[PDB]
Ligand binder design. Structure first.
Ligand code: HEM
Length: 152
């Protein structure tokens, strides 16, 4: 649960992402894959990537980063009223992709890391607080659907 002022911070930060969605999406995925190499094994289309240089050169990885962040941005713009947008993603991630909730924690922290890396000194303590709360809400509502499905 976020206040109006917190949502305002979230959507202000998101404007930074929307200025270069593919570059942010690329770096988020590279941070996830290099920090947590077990996550790469969930992607049949990226498992061939052995080095970060290969990851950086991959146009399909940048494409997938655009898909991921476009979906997250659509959810964030709902300011918590995201049941319809979140349900299909929870279902596909539990039943088809088999993504444990832990990996959603990993990517949440990766988003925070990339924001500081690309906007050093321009991602303030209030903005980090609000973004973290928004990603926690997203993860918690997915977790509720995972529990319904019995997925671990
Ligand atoms: C911010 C969180 C994320 C968002 C919004 C997101 C969004 C999406 C979307 C929109 C798709 C395509 C449609 C679908 O299959 O449902 C997708 C595919 C996928 N997601 Fe996620 N995702 C997230 C996190 C992750 C994480 C953490 C992993 C794994 C570590 C992951 C693994 C996958 C895989 C394996 C695919 C299928 C890729 C394919 O082969 O083309 N997702 N995701």
């Amino acid at each position: 649960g976020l206040s109006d002022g917190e949502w305002q911070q979230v959507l202000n930060v998101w404007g930074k992402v929307e200025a270069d969605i593919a570059g942010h999406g690329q770096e988020v995925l590279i941070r996830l894959f290099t920090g947590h190499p077990e996550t790469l094994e969930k992607f049949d289309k990226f498992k061939h990537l052995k080095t970060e240089a290969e990851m950086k050169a991959s146009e399909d990885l940048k494409k997938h980063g655009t898909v991921v962040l476009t979906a997250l941005g659509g959810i964030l713009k709902k300011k918590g009223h995201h049941e319809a947008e979140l349900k299909p993603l929870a279902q596909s991630h539990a039943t088809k992709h088999k993504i444990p909730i832990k990996y959603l924690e990993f990517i949440s922290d990766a988003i925070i890391h990339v924001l500081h890396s690309k906007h050093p000194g321009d991602f303030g303590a209030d903005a980090q607080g609000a973004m973290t709360k928004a990603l926690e809400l997203f993860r918690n509502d997915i977790a509720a659907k995972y529990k319904e499905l019995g997925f671990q």
